[PDB]
Amino acid sequence: FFGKFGIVEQVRVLPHERDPYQTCGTAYVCFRSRMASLRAVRLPVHLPASLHNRVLHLRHLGTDRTSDDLFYFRRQQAISNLVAIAQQLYAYLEERGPLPAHRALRLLFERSYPRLAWRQAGFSVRTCCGSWLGFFSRSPFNELFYLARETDREENAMLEKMVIFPHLLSREKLQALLLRAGRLLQMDLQNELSVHWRTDRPPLPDWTQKQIQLWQHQDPLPEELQIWSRTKDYYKIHEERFLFKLKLKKERAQAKQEMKQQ
């Protein structure tokens, strides 16, 4: 995991007081570079179910910087706020008709995390889309709204001369669109936590990939050794039909591999 940020000099995991084969829950990661360590400390580490769904908390020993353990839930709140903002803007357009951008945007509010205090809607937009233009141009919000001409300075000037028009939808279509927007934002949230560990790294030989696999899975034992487990009580060991079936399966697999090659 931590190779994504630079060269890792060492990783150590403290054993449990009562079971040296298990961990107490603490580890130390020593990096080659200060910048790499500082980049690594920024986000917490979310683990899958097989690792008990734990969220690992990181603490830099040279600067006291800590990971942002509330990132996931704050982003979930931001996504809910964005969906609410879209619904509010659509309702405002349905009531007052087409509206200018700089006046419509000031009618939209979000609820802060975690206690849900009303706020001017400017943070969810920049945490989920980066800007109001991104919000409008990214799907499925461009299926709800249509921007029309009559840096931050460019953004403000560009919005100061627009009118937001609605796409006339039914209740069911709008509800489906809102659910779709929520799902897509959720996927965006998961991507940044599950970035791939081979990003910007050289390819690995087949032997190296097998060594990587062996840390998690063991290859099946050879079938020639396995055949001896057929008990004499019910089986005839080394039976002709059984061995011919094995040969036919091997031939079929080789033929399929040849087809794949060609």
């Binding site: 060991i237 039976e239 002709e240 039909r241 061995l243 011919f244 079936k245």
Partner: protein, 112 residues
């Protein structure tokens, strides 16, 4: 143990039905070709039959040794291959060996 020197002769049908009769002939007539006109049930009448040229043992002990150690498995794998190429194990209308093995890996039912 019989001590007769008579030669065994197999008369195959000339109708290509694979039907045969069997008899014996004197050793003096080794190079004499026997031919007869006899009934052939494959075609339902009398056709010609002609004598043919007719150009180790796998015992119980050898079978047991192979199946317990599998050091000369090819001998029986060849018989399995011949059966497979001929048309055994075709899944249908076959009471004897419809399948190579059951789902659990046994070669059943025992038909021999």
């Amino acid at each position: 143990r019989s001590r007769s020197k008579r030669l065994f002769v197999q008369l195959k049908s000339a109708a290509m039905t694979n039907f045969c009769y069997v008899t014996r002939k004197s050793p003096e007539k080794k190079n004499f070709r026997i031919a007869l006109r006899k009934y052939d049930p494959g075609v339902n009448k009398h056709v010609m039959f002609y004598e043919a040229r007719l150009p180790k043992q796998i015992t119980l002990s050898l079978q047991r040794y192979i199946r317990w150690t599998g050091k000369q498995v090819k001998l029986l794998l060849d018989k399995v291959e011949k059966a497979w190429e001929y048309g055994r194990f075709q899944k249908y209308f076959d009471n004897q060996a419809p399948l190579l093995t059951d789902r659990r890996g046994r070669a059943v039912p025992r038909y021999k």
